[PDB]
Amino acid sequence: SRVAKAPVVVPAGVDVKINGQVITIKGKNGELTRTLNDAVEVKHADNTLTFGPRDGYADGWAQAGTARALLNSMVIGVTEGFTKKLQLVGVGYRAAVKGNVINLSLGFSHPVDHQLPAGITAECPTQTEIVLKGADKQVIGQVAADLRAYRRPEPYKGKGVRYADEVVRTKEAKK
Amino acid sequence: MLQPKRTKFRKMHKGRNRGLAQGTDVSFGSFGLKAVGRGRLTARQIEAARRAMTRAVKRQGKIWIRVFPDKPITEKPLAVRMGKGKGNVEYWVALIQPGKVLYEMDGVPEELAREAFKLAAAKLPIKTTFVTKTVM
Amino acid sequence: MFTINAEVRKEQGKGASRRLRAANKFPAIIYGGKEAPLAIELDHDKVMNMQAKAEFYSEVLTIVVDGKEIKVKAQDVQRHPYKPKLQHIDFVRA
Amino acid sequence: QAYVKLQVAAGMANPSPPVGPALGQQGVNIMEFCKAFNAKTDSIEKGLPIPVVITVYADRSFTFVTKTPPAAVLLKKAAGIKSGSGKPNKDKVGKISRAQLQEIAQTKAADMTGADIEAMTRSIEGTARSMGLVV
Amino acid sequence: ALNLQDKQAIVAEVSEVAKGALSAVVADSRGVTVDKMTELRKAGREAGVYMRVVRNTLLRRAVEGTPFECLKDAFVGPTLIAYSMEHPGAAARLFKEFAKANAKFEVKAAAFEGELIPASQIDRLATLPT
Amino acid sequence: TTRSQGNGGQNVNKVNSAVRATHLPTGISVLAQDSRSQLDNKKLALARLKEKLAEMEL
Amino acid sequence: MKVRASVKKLCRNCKIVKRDGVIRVICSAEPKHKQRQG
RNA sequence: AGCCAGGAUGUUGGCUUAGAAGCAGCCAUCAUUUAAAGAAAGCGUAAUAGCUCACUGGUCGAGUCGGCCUGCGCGGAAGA
RNA sequence: CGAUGUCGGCUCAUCACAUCCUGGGGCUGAAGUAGGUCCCAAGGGUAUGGCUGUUCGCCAUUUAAAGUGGUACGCGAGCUG
Ligand SMILES: [Mg+2]
Ligand SMILES: [Mg+2]
Ligand SMILES: [Mg+2]
Ligand SMILES: [Mg+2]
Ligand SMILES: [Mg+2]
Ligand SMILES: [Mg+2]
Ligand SMILES: [Mg+2]
Ligand SMILES: [Mg+2]
Ligand SMILES: [Mg+2]
Ligand SMILES: [Mg+2]
Ligand SMILES: [Mg+2]
Ligand SMILES: [Mg+2]
Ligand SMILES: [Mg+2]
Ligand SMILES: [Mg+2]
Ligand SMILES: [Mg+2]
Ligand SMILES: [Mg+2]
Ligand SMILES: [Mg+2]
Ligand SMILES: [Mg+2]
Ligand SMILES: [Mg+2]
Ligand SMILES: [Mg+2]
Ligand SMILES: [Zn+2]
C-alpha cells in the first residue's frame, strides 16, 4: 500500500536482476538474493523498482510493501552497507575479534565466542564497543541480537551487552 | 437491600419469565442502563451495581433504580430429600425482560454516566446497554 | 425540515409487520383530519437518522407517497425494547 | 547553558543550607557566586531575593546577568502582609488597588515582556487573585 | 480551525496587507525563541501589537489570499517565506532588523528577498527615509 | 474436609463428614465431624474456629 | 507476563498485537503491562 | 503517524512540614508574550535541578478517525 | 437383593496434570542469596518412624521433593481381618 507506492530508485552501479519472484541485487559492498512472495509484482522501469499486487492474491499490498522495504534495505546494504554498534557495560566485560570469531568475556566461567556468518564483518575500536558491518540488514541485526543475547543488559545497572543506540531503563533495589 | 417490607404471601411459584419488558423507556433521569438479556437480578446484584455506579459518580447527580425485587426465591437446605414441602425463601429477585431499564442517572456528564453504568453492568448477570432519554 | 419517502402498505398485520422489519422497513400510519387513516411503510434507516434530532418530534413533517405530499406531526413512535430500532410511528395530519 | 535561577533574600550571604548542593552540582566554587551577589546588591537595598542567570564556561569565568526583584515579594511589600492566603475563596485576605498594581508593574516594565504595562498589571491582578487577594 | 476561523484568518491577513504598505520576509529554519520573541518585542516597543510573527505561507492559504492585492507574493510561497507586515510610516526602518537577526546566529534561510515593495531587486536596500 | 475421625460405625469411618479447618495465617487447625452433614459441620465448627482464633489473638 | 483472559491497554504505551493467533499487549515502557491472552 | 522547531512570565502561588520550586497533599486553579504553552498530563529529587505530555508552527502529499448495527470467525477452554 | 465382599494395611500398580522436586521462561514491591507469582513441561523421581484399626492428623528426624486426583474412593477367585 502506502509503502509499496514509494518507488526505490537504483543508483549507478546497481545491478538488478529479476527472475520471476527471485530478485538479486549486486553493488559495491556485495550481492544479495531474495525470493519474493508470489503475490508481489516487481517491475524495473529503466531507473527504479516498483511494487504492486498480483491479482487474485488477497494480502497483496501487505506483501508488496514488505517486499518493497526489503529491496530498499537490499539497495542500502549493497551500496553503503549497514552498521550495528553494540556497547558493553560492567567491569572486565571485553570484546576481541580473531578474524571472524568474536571473543567475548563477560564474567563467565568460560570464554564466550560467536562465529559470524559469511556476509558480515566485525571490529572493536575500543575495549567494550563493537562496530559490526555488513550487507544484509536482517543478518546484521541477527548477529547484533546474538551478541546482545550472550548477556542481555540487566535493568539494575545497565550491566551487560547493550546496543550502542539503545537506552536502557534502570530500576532501583528498594529497601 | 431492596426487599418488600411486607408481602401478601410468603412463597411464590417458580413461574415463567417470558415476554419483553415494560419499563423500557428512560423516564425519570437522563441516562439509562437497559437490559438486553433475560434473567433475574437478586437484590444482592442490584445493590452491588448500585454501589459501584454511585461510587463512580462520586455522589453527584441522582440515581434511579427502576427494578425492585419482589419475587421470593426458595431453596431447600443441603442434604435434604425432595419432598416435605417448598424450601425457604433465601433471597429476592426481580425478573428482567429484555429492555427493562435497570438504572437511570442525571446530574453527570454523559461520559461519566457511561463509565458508571459500565462499572455497574460488570456486576450484573445479564448483558446491558447504555441508552438516553429521548423526546417522545 | 424532514421529507420522508413512504409507500402505501399493500398488506397489514403482524406477519407483514415482522416481514418488513426484517426487510429493512417499518410500518407507520398517518391519521387525523377527514381522510381515512393512511397505512404507510417507511425506510427505517432514513427515518432512524431523521428522528435522531430532537426537533423531529416537534416540527411539522412532510411525507411523499406516490408523488403526493402530506404534512403531519409525529404523534407516537414504537421502538424496539432493547434495540435502537423503530417499530412503528403514529403521524397526525397537520 | 546550565542556567537555573535558585536564590534567596539578599540578607543571607552564603546560602549553603537552603540550596547548597543544587548550586554546587559541579565542582564550581561557592565563594564566587556569593561575592558576585554581594557586589550586585551593594547598589540596592538588602533583604530581597535577586534572580541571576548563570553561564559556566570551560575557561573558568562564569557570566551572570541580574533581573528585577520578584513580583511575589514586591506585592508582599505592597500589601503589607506576611502570609498570603490559605484556601482563598472562603474568607477574603485583603483589598488591592488597580493604581498600586500599575505602579508596581511600571518599575519592572523595562525588564518585562510587555509594551502596554496594563497587560502585566492585569496579570499581577490575576496573580494576587489566584493567591487570594481580590483587586 | 475549520472553514469559519479560516475565513476570519484570511480576512485579518487581507486587511493587514491592505492597510500596510511595507513588509519584511523571514524563514526560521533555526529560528530560536530568543529571535522570535526579540522581534515581537521590538514590534511592541516600536508600536502596537499589530505586527505579528505569524507563520502561514502555505501553498494553498496565503497563495489563495494574495490575488486581492500585491499579487507578486504568489511566487514567494515556495521555499517557505513568511511575512511580517508594517502599517504605519513611509518605508519603516524595521527591514534591516531581520537582516541583523539573520546575521546574528541564523542559518540564513530567509534569503532576505524584500518582496520588492518598491519594485527593487532581492538585494539589501540600505537607503531609507531618516 | 475428610472422613469422620473417632469411633462410630462404618458410615462414620467411611463418609467424608469431618471438615477439619485450618486458619493458615495462624495455623490454628480445628473443625468437627459432629453433624452428619458436611456443611453443618463446616459452619458449626467454624464458629469454634473463630473462637480459637479469638482466644489466640486475645 | 500476565496471562489473562481479558487483555487491555493499561497505559498510553501498551499496544495490542496478534501473534500466531494469540492476542498480546506489549508495553514499550512498562514491563508489568506485558499481557498475554490465555 | 513520523521526520524539522517550540513548549515562556507572573510563580519558587499561599501553606504543614524537615524541606515542597507542578509533582506529598489542599484550596485558588487566573492572567500575561501570544502561532502556543494546563499554576500543570507524565518521568525524575532530599528539595531542586533534570527528560518529557497537552497546544503552535515546518516537510511529503490523499485519505484519516471512532462510534453504531450486523455475518462469519479468535481466545476464555484443564482428567484420568 | 435366584449376592456386584464394605474401611485400613501389604504386594502390585496404571493413567490424568489442576506439577511437590529436577527442566525452560515472564513480571516482581527481583541488587546477590533466597523468595513471591504466573506460564510451558508428565521424562524420571516423589520419606522412615512414635500414637492410632485408621485413611487423615499431630509429632520426631530426613529428603531435591516427600504432589493432587482417576482407576468398583484401583488391587480379599492376590494376602491380611
Ligand atoms: Mg403460565
Ligand atoms: Mg412481565
Ligand atoms: Mg405468527
Ligand atoms: Mg456415604
Ligand atoms: Mg488458566
Ligand atoms: Mg502530525
Ligand atoms: Mg467461542
Ligand atoms: Mg444386592
Ligand atoms: Mg446370578
Ligand atoms: Mg501444564
Ligand atoms: Mg517462576
Ligand atoms: Mg509419573
Ligand atoms: Mg507422554
Ligand atoms: Mg512414564
Ligand atoms: Mg515401642
Ligand atoms: Mg469417587
Ligand atoms: Mg478401592
Ligand atoms: Mg489410588
Ligand atoms: Mg482388603
Ligand atoms: Mg475384627
Ligand atoms: Zn503500558
Curated annotation (Swiss-Prot), chain B:
PTM: Is hydroxylated on Arg-81 by RoxA. The modification is nearly suppressed when E.coli is grown in anoxia.
Annotated positions of the (3R)-3-hydroxyarginine modification: 81
Entry GO MF terms: rRNA binding; structural constituent of ribosome; tRNA binding
GO CC annotations, alphabetized: cytoplasm; cytosolic large ribosomal subunit
GO biological process: cytoplasmic translation; ribosomal large subunit assembly
Pfam families in alphabetical order: Ribosomal_L16
UniProt keyword terms in alphabetical order: Hydroxylation, Methylation, Ribonucleoprotein, Ribosomal protein, RNA-binding, rRNA-binding, tRNA-binding
Domain of life where this protein originates: Bacteria
Residue intervals passing through the bilayer: none
Annotated positions of the N-methylmethionine modification: 1
Family: Belongs to the universal ribosomal protein uL16 family.
Function comment: Binds directly to 23S ribosomal RNA and is located at the A site of the peptidyltransferase center. It contacts the A and P site tRNAs. One of the last ribosomal proteins to be assembled in the 50S subunit. The simultaneous presence of uL16 and bL36 probably triggers ObgE's GTPase activity and eventual dissociation from the mature 50S ribosmal subunit. It has an essential role in subunit assembly.
Assembly description: Part of the 50S ribosomal subunit. Cross-links to the A and P site tRNAs. Interacts with assembly factor DarP(YjgA).
HAMAP family attached to this UniProt entry: Ribosomal_uL16
NCBIfam families: rplP_bact (TIGR01164)
Protein's UniProt name: Large ribosomal subunit protein uL16
Organism (species): Escherichia coli (strain K12)
Phylogenetic lineage: Bacteria, Pseudomonadati, Pseudomonadota, Gammaproteobacteria, Enterobacterales
UniProtKB/Swiss-Prot annotation, chain C:
Entry GO MF terms: 5S rRNA binding; structural constituent of ribosome
Stored Pfam families: Ribosomal_L25p
BP terms from Gene Ontology: cytoplasmic translation; negative regulation of translation; response to radiation; ribosomal large subunit assembly; translation
Top-level taxon of origin: Bacteria
Gene Ontology, cellular component aspect: cytoplasm; cytosol; cytosolic large ribosomal subunit
rRNA-binding is among the record's keywords: yes
InterPro entries (UniProt xref): Rbsml_bL25/Gln-tRNA_synth_N, Ribosomal_bL25/Gln-tRNA_synth, Ribosomal_bL25_short, Ribosomal_L25_dom, Ribosomal_uL5_bac-type
Keyword RNA-binding: yes
Keyword terms: Ribonucleoprotein, Ribosomal protein, RNA-binding, rRNA-binding
Family from the record: Belongs to the bacterial ribosomal protein bL25 family.
NCBIfam families: PRK05943.1 (NF004612)
Record note on quaternary structure: Part of the 50S ribosomal subunit; part of the 5S rRNA/L5/L18/L25 subcomplex. Contacts the 5S rRNA.
Biological role stated in the UniProt entry: This is one of the proteins that binds to the 5S RNA in the ribosome where it forms part of the central protuberance. Binds to the 5S rRNA independently of L5 and L18. Not required for binding of the 5S rRNA/L5/L18 subcomplex to 23S rRNA.
Protein name: Large ribosomal subunit protein bL25
Organism from which the protein derives: Escherichia coli (strain K12)
Classification lineage: Bacteria, Pseudomonadati, Pseudomonadota, Gammaproteobacteria, Enterobacterales
Curated annotation (Swiss-Prot), chain D:
CDD domains: Ribosomal_L11
N6-succinyllysine PTM sites in chain numbering: 67, 76
One GO location term (cellular component): cytosol
Superkingdom classification of source: Bacteria
Signal sequence annotation: none
Alphabetically ordered keywords of this record: Methylation, Ribonucleoprotein, Ribosomal protein, RNA-binding, rRNA-binding
PROSITE patterns the UniProt entry points to: RIBOSOMAL_L11
Matches recorded under Pfam families: Ribosomal_L11, Ribosomal_L11_N
Residues where N6,N6,N6-trimethyllysine is found: 35
One BP annotation, GO: ribosomal large subunit assembly
Gene Ontology MF term list: large ribosomal subunit rRNA binding; rRNA binding; structural constituent of ribosome
SS bond partners: none
Entry-linked PANTHER family: 60S RIBOSOMAL PROTEIN L12 (PTHR11661), LARGE RIBOSOMAL SUBUNIT PROTEIN UL11M (PTHR11661:SF1)
Function: Forms part of the ribosomal stalk which helps the ribosome interact with GTP-bound translation factors.
Subunit and interaction comment: Part of the ribosomal stalk of the 50S ribosomal subunit. Interacts with L10 and the large rRNA to form the base of the stalk. L10 forms an elongated spine to which 2 L12 dimers bind in a sequential fashion forming a pentameric L10(L12)2(L12)2 complex.
Family: Belongs to the universal ribosomal protein uL11 family.
Protein name per UniProt: Large ribosomal subunit protein uL11
Species: Escherichia coli (strain K12)
Gene name of this polypeptide: rplK
Swiss-Prot record, chain E:
Similarity field: Belongs to the universal ribosomal protein uL10 family.
Protein name: Large ribosomal subunit protein uL10
Function (record text): Forms part of the ribosomal stalk, playing a central role in the interaction of the ribosome with GTP-bound translation factors.
More info: Ribosomal protein L8 appears to be an aggregate of ribosomal proteins L7/L12 and L10.
Record note on quaternary structure: Part of the ribosomal stalk of the 50S ribosomal subunit. The N-terminus interacts with L11 and the large rRNA to form the base of the stalk. The C-terminus forms an elongated spine to which 2 L12 dimers bind in a sequential fashion forming a pentameric L10(L12)(L12)2 complex. Two L12 dimers associate with a copy of L10 to form a very strong complex (called L8).
List of residues that carry N6-acetyllysine: 36, 104
Keywords for the protein's UniProt record, in alphabetical order: Acetylation, Repressor, Ribonucleoprotein, Ribosomal protein, RNA-binding, rRNA-binding, Translation regulation
CC per GO annotation: cytoplasm; cytosol; cytosolic large ribosomal subunit; large ribosomal subunit
A biological process term (GO) from this entry: cytoplasmic translation
Species of origin: Escherichia coli (strain K12)
Listed GO MF terms: large ribosomal subunit rRNA binding; ribosome binding; structural constituent of ribosome
Included range, full protein: 2 to 131 of 165
Gene: rplJ
Record's signal peptide: none
